[PDB]
């Protein structure tokens, strides 16, 4: 239906055209028209602070050693998302104490992580989970709504007498012991710890978009136009990681004065609200004289890598994110310039070594013979979330990995009688894990059900599959590695699609890693499974470059099979690598039909991958096109059912290896080990991430 007022703002028209839901277009128009009439935003606000400006109230590392007589009790608020439940359990182990409190909010989109957090809250009386769950997108207004609601919840928990409020994510980690944290805060229990930009405040406003009106809907932040900064108050901001004492949280929650009321309205339509809301309120409130310009955090900003506007599809704005710590950063945690107790970010799938160094440095080594200290397991599919949360690609390949494990069990037993290790697959995978060892990706772990055919009984197994090496070097050049994948993370310089799983409708990206040396120009060539040359281009490697990548515009679908990517230097071979474009056995999670398989597995719809042709280079690169295998690719493109499964399993076996397979419960295969007794299974002991009973000192670590 038509809007309540003429909508002419260029920004609002752009958002109305991109929004999908009807509810979202309506809410956009309603917000715009309200602001047009001046009924949405405040224009002047009262300032209650007596000071004419800001206060900002000698760091001696030996002051955190005394024992408090009246130690503070802390309420930790954990805002978490993703799949890294074992890392979160490790950090929870490091910060836990029986006298503190823990209130955990799990992103609405992360049900696997939520089910794991629930098991934690059930074990301990001082651990609770938020019953409400928002989709806290990056920069979304909902993050402030999350904090403010948890503050109200926590203030109403009579049985939890807490003195400080600390917020942490699944990527934070302490850099000092709990004893020192309590000693420090017990000395300054009337202070509030927040860090400001300290530079030009007008530039801070513009780059944060504070003078712009935003609306959060459909998990997106829509920019709707301009707005005025309210008069009569000082606007400030910086980090959205802080420590606030109960006195001030009580004021922000229950105050009805002009300042708190109007600031809650203003910041309901603000981008990155938690980065300036608490600063602004504090500095203009009666508590202005309690502010310390230090958030007690070390944040690993590296704006040469972390500001690629990577959230352009989530928010109508460009921003930055902090980098992940590496082992060479350990010395930074030992600075004595200012007091610091936490740091971010840490990601175990990126680098776990620094996590282990930090945790042993704070609370010591685990006893000798402790297993799994250098390993990491991360669940990437859990049965309760349903096969429709997977894609046709991952569903196809996870199925193939399970069959590759069953064939290993059969061939592992050497006998001339009945083979008691022959299995028949049943149903869909029950879970999948990534598996790392010493910060090296080891492959996938698939748990699946199968019938042992000798005894005719159903068994639960887990298979470990590892990808075969495909990078090969052919004169000391600068090239160190080359790879093909999708979902390239520019900040961390790696593919988030860890397995390199690809289907016919994927758009692969080529990456090259280089070492130091003078600048050079090289040639890249893409070759399909029947020697069709899909693309060629030259790229300049500058003397300062370390990684290069590019995504060639390839017409879809890609011909299934094993592709090759070559790197030449003036026709001199340099290196090559391979990747798999797998045919799919599923369409909308159902077995693919012939008419569907035909259109998907027979190559590009335009008869070629690009407008420009490279048929001239086939004889030059010794890549002739065998007329026979071209036709056998047609025949393959028409197959379904058993024939298609044989084609797929043939390709997967050529690029992956079933390393081992174990049973979770009783088994009839005489040569299969119990998963709990292996070193690689997600069922094996992992004490660094396991949580048990509380010890006499009130600790878990």
């Amino acid at each position: 239906q038509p809007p309540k007022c003429d909508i002419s703002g260029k920004e609002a028209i752009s958002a109305l055209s991109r929004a999908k839901s009807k509810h979202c277009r309506q809410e956009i128009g309603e917000t715009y028209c309200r602001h047009k009439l001046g009924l949405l935003m405040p224009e002047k606000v009262t300032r209650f602070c007596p000071l004419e400006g800001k206060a900002n109230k000698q760091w001696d590392e030996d002051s955190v050693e005394y024992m408090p007589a009246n130690p503070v009790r802390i309420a930790f608020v954990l805002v978490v998302h993703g799949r890294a439940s074992r890392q979160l359990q490790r950090m929870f182990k490091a910060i836990y104490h029986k006298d503190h409190f823990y209130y955990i909010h799990v992103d609405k989109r992360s049900n696997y992580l939520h089910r794991q957090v629930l098991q934690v809250s059930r074990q301990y009386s001082n651990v609770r989970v938020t019953p409400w769950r928002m989709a806290t997108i990056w920069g979304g207004a909902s993050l402030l709504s999350t904090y403010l609601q948890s503050m109200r919840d926590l203030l109403e928990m009579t049985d939890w007498p807490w003195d400080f409020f600390i917020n942490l994510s699944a990527a934070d980690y302490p850099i000092r012991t709990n004893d020192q944290l309590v000693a420090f805060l017990s000395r300054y229990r009337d202070m509030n710890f927040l860090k400001s930009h300290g530079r030009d405040n007008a530039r801070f406003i513009r780059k944060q978009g504070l003078d712009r009106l935003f609306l959060e809907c459909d998990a997106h932040m829509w920019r709707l136009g301009d707005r005025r900064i309210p008069e009569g108050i000082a606007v400030d901001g910086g980090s959205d990681w802080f420590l606030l004492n109960r006195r001030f949280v009580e004021y922000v929650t229950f105050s009805t004065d002009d300042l708190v009321t109007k600031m809650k309205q203003f910041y309901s339509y603000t981008l990155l609200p938690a980065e300036s809301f608490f600063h602004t309120v504090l500095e203009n409130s009666p508590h202005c004289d309690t502010m310390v310009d230090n958030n007690l955090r070390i944040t690993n900003w590296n704006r040469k890598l972390g500001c690629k506007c990577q959230y352009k599809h989530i928010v109508d704005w460009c921003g930055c994110s902090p980098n992940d710590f590496k082992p060479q950063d350990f010395h930074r945690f030992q600075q004595t310039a200012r007091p610091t107790f936490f740091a971010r970010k840490f990601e175990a799938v990126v680098n776990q070594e620094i996590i282990g160094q930090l945790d042993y440095y704070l609370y010591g080594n685990y006893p000798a013979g402790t297993p799994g200290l250098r390993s990491y397991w991360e669940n990437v599919y859990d049965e309760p979330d349903g096969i429709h949360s997977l894609s046709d690609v991952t569903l196809t390949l996870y199925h193939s990995f399970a069959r590759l494990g069953l064939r290993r069990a059969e061939t592992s037993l050497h006998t001339d009688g009945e083979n008691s290790c022959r299995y028949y697959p049943m149903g869909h995978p029950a879970s999948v894990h990534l598996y790392f060892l010493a910060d090296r990706f080891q492959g996938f772990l698939i748990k699946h059900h199968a019938t042992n055919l000798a005894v005719s009984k159903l068994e639960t197994l887990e298979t470990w599959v590892m990808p075969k090496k495909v990078f090969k070097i052919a004169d000391f050049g600068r090239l160190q590695f080359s790879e093909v994948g999708t979902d390239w993370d520019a900040k961390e310089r790696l593919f988030r699609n860890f397995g390199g799983l690809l289907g016919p409708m994927d758009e692969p990206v080529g990456m090259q890693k280089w070492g130091k040396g003078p600048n050079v120009t090289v040639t890249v060539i893409w070759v399909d499974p029947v020697n069709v040359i899909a693309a060629t281009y030259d790229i300049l490697i500058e003397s300062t470059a370390e990684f290069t990548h590019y995504k060639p515009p390839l017409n879809l679908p890609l011909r299934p099979g094993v592709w090759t990517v070559k790197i030449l230097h003036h026709w001199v071979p340099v290196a090559e690598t391979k990747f798999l474009v797998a045919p799919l056995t599923f369409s909308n999670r159902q077995p693919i039909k012939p008419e569907e398989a035909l259109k998907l597995h027979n190559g590009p719809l335009r008869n070629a991958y690009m407008e420009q042709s490279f048929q001239s280079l086939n004889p030059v690169l010794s890549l002739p096109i065998n007329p026979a295998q071209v036709e056998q690719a047609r025949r393959n493109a028409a197959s379904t059912g058993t024939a298609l499964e044989g084609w797929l399993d043939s390709l997967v076996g050529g690029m992956w290896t079933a390393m081992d397979i174990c049973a979770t419960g009783p088994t009839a295969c005489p040569v299969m080990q119990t998963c709990s007794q292996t070193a690689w299974s997600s069922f094996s002991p992992d004490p660094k991430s396991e949580l048990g009973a509380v010890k006499p000192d009130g600790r878990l670590r």
């Binding site: 920069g139 530079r199 978009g209 980090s239 990155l272 955090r297 109508d316 930055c320």
Partner: peptide, 9 residues
Amino acid sequence: EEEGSGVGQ
């Protein structure tokens, strides 16, 4: 040098 996460439009 925690100067906020926003860059610009």
